[PDB]
Design a protein around this nucleic acid. Structure first.
Ligand SMILES: Nc1ccn([C@@H]2O[C@H](COP(=O)(O)OP(=O)(O)OP(=O)(O)O)[C@@H](O)[C@H]2O)c(=O)n1
Ligand SMILES: [Mg+2]
Lengths: 144, 231, 733, 82, 96
RNA sequence: AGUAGUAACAAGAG
RNA sequence: UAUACCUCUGCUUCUGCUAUU
RNA sequence: GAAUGCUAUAAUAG
């Protein structure tokens, strides 16, 4: 239902085939403005930016002030931070699992593909390994 | 560069255990080899002071079955191990822990030992480090121009004191023989930028993850950065 | 000799090549990840799963040990435990009956240290045990939502500092780098370590027990005149919305909390006394019967050496040596010469925003003190002039200079505000800009020093200036000097002004702080009609309630005597929550609208009730003889504290359909106390003074006239009025 | 007691994986009592950390007189094997 | 919210009408777009260094190419035979 | 049958 | 086949994010 | 005459 409805409000947008996943992608953004009051996903970048500019004017320095904090946080943030999110999806077994396990599986899996970024302890170098893992031709993992 | 040099001079023990010390301080071993060599020498000097120094069950120093040395090598051991060792020693023998991390500790003396290698004068560098410690650790300073400045109570014997000054000049000569002595002389400064580079895949995903009327992400970035959408 | 066993077990564990590789690969960091590793999906309906699982044979899991084996398999035909070992504990499973058995016929363990371990709680109990309960009161309570401390602490520290202290107590070896903190709590570390020494309770518990009484649990709650933790803990029993309960806790109460509340009492007395003729009379009347928790205000003011203007005014009023002694958190001053004029002004700060601050005028001299360091300060409007100090402790000297720099409000101090400084709270509440600027520059000092400027040191006898590092230096901070060298009978006017024996005044009730705030300890007024010191909404409700109560008489007396029943002690209190600069104008308006109803036959009891209270403040008419005209009457407090003339308002509205008056939410029936003609009788008449309805909206007259356009009309001129959405009326003068 | 639905299905194997990590951590906590309270920090091997601590503990247990020669030799010998 | 209401209430022009629209948005999740969330980060981190601008940009980029798993599947049954069976999501278009 | 209600249970497994 | 009138199981037959912390 | 910012296995809200 959600999958249908999401695309039902985007169908008048720009539809194309992802040359990465090979999937059917639909892009409503900067699309034709609605003719009625049926849910519209066709947001206009210009208007989203203009809105944010006014917000930035009304609250001066807040964006960089936050960005600073959010950035300085990430640098301190360890990997174990991920082990506090109930049932996370584990790609190694294609089932949900405890956050702490779902991570462990990924760290153990990554090591086999020569990805030890986790071991450094900070979240950033572990994150680097995730966006790197996409460029691996094959991905190898333990399964009992 | 220093890359090929340290492989010949120092063993993998000293190479790696230093690169761990550098890693914990979060500075690249290759982008600052001057800093690597300093800690390598700093570590190699410390091991020589506690190499053959052994204690018997009676409680007297002797030269080398038996597994209990006279000194305790703190330099090399990771921070949280080093500090555990340092605290464990202080609390056991019953003295206050120094606020700074020590290099060595003599089990017979029951005192902490701070080691320091300098380029100019060893006598000057003794009074420089006396400001921080004062009398928390019994300093033991050395330099490459055959100049030693130990504490009033120095346990280091005549046969021991030589090996240090020998290896100090032996390496200092080997750096001059390879024309790499000049590499350590010149100043080296670099702030370690927190670089997070994107791969090929994720970069492509980003380019297809853009609003309509954009060739690639670079476009969306520069559009957002530059143009003002008032009205 | 536990060490050997561990090493012997490590050899056993390292024979499992799976465990070996886990230990060899998993970093000390990653311990945190693999510790939380389990099969168990998180139980989403535990309330159910428990209720169900309790009906099973063996729901519980023993820890495999010699103690587990002391429990028998069955007792008098009751299966206590099974052979089958739990997946988790790898020990025998058991029924809830097992616990009940152990607690009955189990071995008797050593409960030594327990009380010292769980002292935190035993005190929590001891406070209730050695408490005294007063009377319950039924009446309106305006609860304010504020961030408060939930549990009294042994000593307050940041979580980081707190944790580091706990490490020093329980886990000496695994402490890491020794911090300043270690030395700062050396007494508490040793004290706790000596108390927890002989105990068999698990260190991890002792950790959380210390954490409970060192780490501050500070959360938002709806409170009313009780902020003190030892009150907050009992907040559920202290008050409701519509009832209050007097409760004196036990143990001890802080001199600071005794002080800070003692101020609010005086401020609240003065605030209310100002309205009556002979304020001193009422000020004295209340003050004598004002109790701070269990301690009389007079006794408290006598006992405590410190407090604000109000404290001194009330001290004088009672007859006590007024201490012009002053505080600014850490800094504590005492005036030698000067007179301060607090003017609210828009200050630009270093980060580049405009903050409203109360700036003090005139050149004043104070005896500044900070710990073991003392000094003499001299300041003018937003400029420090000269600061003499002693060479006591290095940090105590360093703090005094920063405190004096901030206190002076120097335009240089405001320039050195670089970074994020919050004057507004996460919940959009006001924080004291001076007390936040004080709090900011105590953390970042090097900015202030560099943003101030230096100059040549003094070359006098015992004067030798100090630089940034607080050492006898050549360059000293612009107007700072270090030296080797470290009342009068007043009377108070009935109108509350402290006059010298010469004639010059030192304080007045016009000089006290306008800011009401939540008293730390419970403030009680042992005179009947204590509600008079209450909040806007409390006073508003209690007043209109008293109007409704005596409406029978008050309405009749109005139809005989004109101004006989305008002067009532309830309406006096009510004036103290009216803005003084509109009080008279409102009375001027209201009395005219009332008299207009009485004389011209057109009555309206709901309006009479609404306006009658305003008719106390001596009337203030316009220069052309006619009264001021109003749409809403704003009162002291939030932007919701106002009475609408034409419509209803968050304080006051009448429902004619039900004949129900609604006051601050509380519903009262006007059935029986209502005239028959009123229902059909329009409101249009009792809305403007000297204005009455003629007909209905006349398009010829045009749009609806404003207060101004109405006030600027010649008698017998028609106009279009709107009472409320969809009630147009044609009103004439 | 833990829901034992897992005993029937092939997921069984995970209990050994758990009770492995459990063994590793539990012992680590016997070496570092602080680990239970505050998060231990280090990018070095757990074994490395555990070894040194036990070495110091043993040495100072011998020097203090909490441990005997027979036991200390066994300690340094057993730790030697690692 | 009590403080917010108090001000926005009292700030109302005298004579003018203050109105509160008790509001709720429909299909909040379905309608909002990742590529908009990408723009938001890019505009919010304008003064942030190159790496952190990019770091933030990933989460939206993943969401703008994300794949939704279709749960367990659909159960088909014969009442006559009293047989039930789960059809896996991969085998949805196996049966007519 | 029934519960229940946009899809399940009315035992499941070796 | 068979053991099986036996044996094991009763959230694990996919339970998320963000606040109140 | 102000502060102190956090960070559950429950429940509620979206
Ligand atoms: N259990 C929930 C409820 C709500 N939400 C979040 O809150 C939003 C608002 O939920 P709601 O108002 O209940 O529904 P809508 O998304 O508005 O859907 P509808 O069009 O049916 O009103 C959701 O989109 C989602 O972002 C959520 O994450 N989890
Ligand atoms: Mg909705």
């Amino acid at each position: 239902d959600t999958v249908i409805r999401t695309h039902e409000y985007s169908n008048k947008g720009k539809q194309y085939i992802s040359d990465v996943t090979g999937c059917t992608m639909v892009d409503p953004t900067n699309g034709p403005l609605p003719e009625d009051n049926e849910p519209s996903a066709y947001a206009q970048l210009d208007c989203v930016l203009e809105a944010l500019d006014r917000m930035d004017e009304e609250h001066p320095g807040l964006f960089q002030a936050a960005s600073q904090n959010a950035m300085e946080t990430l640098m301190v943030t360890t990997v174990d931070k991920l082990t506090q999110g109930r049932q996370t999806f584990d790609w190694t077994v294609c089932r949900n699992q405890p956050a702490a396990t779902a991570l462990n599986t990924t760290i153990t899996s990554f090591r086999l593909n020569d990805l030890n970024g986790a071991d450094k302890g900070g979240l950033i170098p572990f994150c680097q390994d995730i966006i790197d893992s996409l460029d691996r031709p094959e991905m190898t993992f333990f399964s009992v | 560069s220093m890359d090929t040099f340290i492989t010949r001079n120092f063993q993998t023990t000293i190479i790696q255990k230093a690169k761990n010390t550098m890693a914990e301080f979060s500075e690249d071993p290759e982008l600052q080899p001057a800093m690597l060599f300093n800690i390598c020498v700093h570590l190699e000097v410390c091991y020589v002071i506690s190499d053959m120094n052994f204690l018997d069950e009676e409680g007297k120093a002797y030269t080398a079955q038996n597994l209990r040395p006279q000194y305790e090598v703190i330099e090399g051991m990771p921070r949280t191990i080093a500090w555990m060792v340092q605290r464990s020693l202080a609390q056991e023998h019953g003295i206050e822990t120094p606020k700074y991390l020590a290099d060595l500790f003599d089990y017979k003396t029951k005192r902490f030992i701070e080691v320091g290698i300098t380029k100019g004068l060893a006598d000057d560098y003794f009074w420089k480090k006396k400001e921080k410690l004062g009398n928390s650790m019994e300093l033991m300073i050395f330099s490459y121009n055959q100049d030693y400045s130990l504490s009033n109570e120095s346990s280091l014997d005549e046969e021991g004191k030589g090996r240090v000054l020998s290896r100090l000049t032996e390496l200092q000569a080997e750096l001059s023989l390879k024309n790499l002595w000049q590499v350590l002389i010149g100043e080296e400064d670099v702030e370690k930028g927190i670089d997070f580079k994107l791969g090929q895949t994720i970069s492509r995903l980003r380019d297809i993850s853009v609003p309509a009327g954009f060739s690639n992400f670079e476009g969306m970035r520069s559009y957002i950065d530059n143009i003002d959408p008032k009205g | 000799g536990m060490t050997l066993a561990k090493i012997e077990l490590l050899k056993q564990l390292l024979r499992d090549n799976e465990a070996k590789t886990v230990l060899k690969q998993t970093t000390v960091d990653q311990y945190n990840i693999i510790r939380k590793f389990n099969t168990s999906r998180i139980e989403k309906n535990p309330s159910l799963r428990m209720k169900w699982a309790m009906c099973s044979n063996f729901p519980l899991a023993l820890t495999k040990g010699d103690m587990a084996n002391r429990i028998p398999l069955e007792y008098k035909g009751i299966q206590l435990k099974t052979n089958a070992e739990d997946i988790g504990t790898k020990g025998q499973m058991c029924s809830i009956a097992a616990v009940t058995w152990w607690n009955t016929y189990g071995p008797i363990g050593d409960t030594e240290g327990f009380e010292r371990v769980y002292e935190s709680f035993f005190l929590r109990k001891m406070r209730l045990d050695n408490a005294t309960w007063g009377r319950i009161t039924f009446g309106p309570v305006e609860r304010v939502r504020k961030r408060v401390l939930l549990n009294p602490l042994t000593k307050e520290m940041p979580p980081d500092e707190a944790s580091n202290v706990i490490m020093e107590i329980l886990f000496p070896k695994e402490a890491g780098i020794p911090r300043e903190s270690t030395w700062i709590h050396r007494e508490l570390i040793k004290e706790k370590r000596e108390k927890l020494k002989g105990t068999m309770i698990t260190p991890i518990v002792l950790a959380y027990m210390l954490e409970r009484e060192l780490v501050a649990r500070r959360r938002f709650l709806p409170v009313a005149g009780a902020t003190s933790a030892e009150f907050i803990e009992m907040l559920h029993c202290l008050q409701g919305e519509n009832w209050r309960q007097i409760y004196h806790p036990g143990g001890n109460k802080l001199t600071e909390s005794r002080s800070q509340s003692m101020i609010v009492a005086c401020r609240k007395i003065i605030r209310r006394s100002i309205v009556a003729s002979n304020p001193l009379e009422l000020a004295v009347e209340i003050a004598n019967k004002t109790v701070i928790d269990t301690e009389p205000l007079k006794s408290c003011l006598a006992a405590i050496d410190g407090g604000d203007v109000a404290c001194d005014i009330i001290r004088a009023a009672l007859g006590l040596k007024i201490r012009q002694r002053q505080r600014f958190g850490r800094l504590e001053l005492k005036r030698i010469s000067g007179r301060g004029f607090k003017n609210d002004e828009e200050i630009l700060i270093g980060n580049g925003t405009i903050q409203k601050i109360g700036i003090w005028d005139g050149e004043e001299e104070f005896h500044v003190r900070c710990g073991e360091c003392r000094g003499i300060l001299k300041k003018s409007k937003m400029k420090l002039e000269k600061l003499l100090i002693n060479s006591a402790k290095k940090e105590d000297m360093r703090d005094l200079i920063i405190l004096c720099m901030v206190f002076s409000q120097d335009t240089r101090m405001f320039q050195g505000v670089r970074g994020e400084i919050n004057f507004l709270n996460r919940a959009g509440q006001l924080l004291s800009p001076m007390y936040q600027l004080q709090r900011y520059f105590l953390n970042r000092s090097n900015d202030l020093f560099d943003q101030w400027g230096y100059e040549e040191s003094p070359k006098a006898s015992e004067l030798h200036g100090i630089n940034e590092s607080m050492n006898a230096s050549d360059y000293t901070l612009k107007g700072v000097v270090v030296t080797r060298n470290v009342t009068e009978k007043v009377s108070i006017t009935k109108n509350l002004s402290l006059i010298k024996r010469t004639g010059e005044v030192i304080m007045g009730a016009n000089d006290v702080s306008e800011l009401e705030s939540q008293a730390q300890l419970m403030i009680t007024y042992d005179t009947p009609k204590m509600w008079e010191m209450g909040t806007t909404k409390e006073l508003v409700q209690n007043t209109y309630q008293w109007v409704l109560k005596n409406l029978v008489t008050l309405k009749a007396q109005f139809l005989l005597g004109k101004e006989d029943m305008f002067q009532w002690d309830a309406f006096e209190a009510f004036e103290s929550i009216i803005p003084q600069k509109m009080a008279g104008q409102y009375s001027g308006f209201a009395r005219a609208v009332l008299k207009q109803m009485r004389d011209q036959e057109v009555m309206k009891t709901d309006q009479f009730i609404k306006l009658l209270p305003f008719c106390f403040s001596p009337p203030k008419l316009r220069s052309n003889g006619e009264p001021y005209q109003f749409l809403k009457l704003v009162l002291k407090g939030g932007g919701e504290n106002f009475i609408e003339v034409r419509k209803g308002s968050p304080l006051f509205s009448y429902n004619p359909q039900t004949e129900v008056l609604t006051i601050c939410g509380r519903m009262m029936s006007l059935k029986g106390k209502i005239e028959d003609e009123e229902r059909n009788r329009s409101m249009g008449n009792a809305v403007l003074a000297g204005f009455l309805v003629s007909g209905k909206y006349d398009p010829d007259l045009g749009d609806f006239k404003t207060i101004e356009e109405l006030e600027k009309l010649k008698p017998g001129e028609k106009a279009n009025i709107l009472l409320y959405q969809g009630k147009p009326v044609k009103v004439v003068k | 007691k833990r829901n034992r639905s897992i005993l029937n299905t092939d997921q069984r194997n995970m209990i050994l994986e758990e009770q492995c990590y459990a063994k590793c951590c539990n012992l680590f906590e016997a070496c570092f009592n602080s680990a239970s309270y505050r998060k231990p920090v280090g990018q070095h091997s757990m074994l490395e950390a555990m070894a040194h601590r036990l070495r110091m503990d043993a040495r100072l247990d011998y020097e203090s007189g909490r441990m005997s020669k027979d036991d200390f030799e066994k300690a340094m010998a057993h730790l030697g094997e690692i | 919210l009590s403080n917010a209401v108090a001000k926005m209430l009292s700030n109302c022009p005298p004579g003018g009408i203050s109105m509160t629209v008790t509001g709720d948005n429909t299909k909040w999740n379905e309608c909002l777009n990742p590529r908009i969330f990408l723009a938001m980060t890019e505009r919010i981190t304008r003064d942030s260094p190159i790496w952190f601008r990019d770091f933030c940009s990933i989460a939206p980029v993943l969401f703008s190419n994300k794949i939704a798993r279709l749960g367990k599947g659909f159960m088909i049954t014969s009442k006559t035979k009293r047989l039930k069976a789960q059809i896996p999501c991969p085998d949805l278009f196996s049966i007519p």
